[PDB]
Design a protein around this ligand. Sequence first.
Ligand SMILES: [Mn+2]
Ligand SMILES: [Mn+2]
Lengths: 213, 213
Amino acid sequence: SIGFIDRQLGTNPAELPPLPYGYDALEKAIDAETMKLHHDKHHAAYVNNLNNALKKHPELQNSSVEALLRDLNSVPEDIRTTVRNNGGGHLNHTIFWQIMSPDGGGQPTGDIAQEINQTFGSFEEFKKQFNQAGGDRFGSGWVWLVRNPQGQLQVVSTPNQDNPIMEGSYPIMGNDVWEHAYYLRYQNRRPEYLNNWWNVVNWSEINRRTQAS
Amino acid sequence: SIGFIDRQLGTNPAELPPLPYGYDALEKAIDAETMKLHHDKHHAAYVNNLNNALKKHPELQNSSVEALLRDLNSVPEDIRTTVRNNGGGHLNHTIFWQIMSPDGGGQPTGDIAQEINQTFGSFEEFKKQFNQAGGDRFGSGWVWLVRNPQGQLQVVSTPNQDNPIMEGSYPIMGNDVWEHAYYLRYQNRRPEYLNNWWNVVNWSEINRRTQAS
Ligand SMILES: [Mn+2]
Ligand SMILES: [Mn+2]
C-alpha cells in the first residue's frame, strides 16, 4: 500500500478522501482558496476520470490504484494513459493531504531525522536539495523523497502525475510543483512556495511512512 | 524566421518583445493581471535564462533562436536543455502576443479560412478539434495549428515549451495551456479558457503567417 499505510487505494469505486483538517488550517504556507480548488476540483477530477475509464473495463475494478500503476503494460491500451495520469493524480494527492498538518513544521524527529542526517549531511542540506529539485522540474510535476529499490533515500522529481512507484520506489513525502498548487498566492514565485511549504510538513506522518517503506 | 515574419529572433542579446497592445486590451478573454505576469514575469524569465546560457558560449550569439531550436544536437550538451526550454519559451510567447488582438475574434477570414474549410470541413469542426487537442494535452504545454513538412495544416500539441519547428513544422498559431495562462480567471476550468480565447484571435496576423508558411 502506498496511498495509505494500512490499506490500498480502492477502485470499486475510487473515492476522494476528505481533508483531515480545515481548508484554512495551512495558511502559513497555503491559502484556503487553493486548498478548496486543489482538493474539491483538481483531486476530485482525477478520481472521477479514473472511475469513468474503469467502467469500460469492469474486470479491473478488483485491483487497486497501486497495482494498476505498478504494471501499466497489463492495463488495456484504450485506457492506459487515462489510468496513468488520473491514477497518478489520485495517488499523489492522497499522499499530499496526509503529509501536511496545522501543527506541522519544525525539524524532523525520530527515524527519518537520523536517516536524513546520514544521507544528506543535515536537515538544512536535505531541504536545499529538495527545493532545488523542485525548482528544476520544468513544467508540471512533483518532487519526492523516496526509498529507492535498493533501500536508499533519494530526492527525485517526476513529470505531470507520474509516480515513483512505477519504478519500484516508495514515495515517503512529496511536494506538488504544478502551477495550480501555488499560483493564487505566489504566482510565478515557485521558490517562495517551496520555502514556505516546510512550515506545514507533518513529520509524525512522514515517520510512519518511513517505517512502512 | 518563425517568431516574426520579416525577421529572425536574435540572441545578441535575446530581447523581450513589447506587448502590441495595452495590458487590459484582451479583457473579454484574458484578465489584465495575467497579461502583466505572463508577459512581464514569465516571458521575461525565458529571455533572461536564455541570455545567461548563451554567455557561456558566445559563438551561439551569432545565430538566431530558430536556428538553435532547429538543430539542438549542435548546441553544447551543458546548456542544450536550457536553450530548448527557454529558447522555446521565448519563441512560443513571442508568436503568442502577435496572434491576439483587441479587435480580434469572429470567424476566420481570407486564405486561412479557405484552407481551414478545405482541410477540416468548417471552422466549427476545426475549433472543436483544436480545443479538444488543448484539453488532451496533460500537464504543461501548447496546442498548435501548424503547416507540416508535407505542406498540410495539422493540429498538434507539444509539451512544456517545446516548439513544432523542432520537428520541421511551421507554427501558424497556437494557444498556451500552461496553468499560468488561465488560473487567475478560470482556475481549473481549462476548457472555458480554450473557448473564450477565440474572441481575441487576430485573424489578420494569422493570414500573414499562413502566407509566410
Ligand atoms: Mn496538484
Ligand atoms: Mn505561458
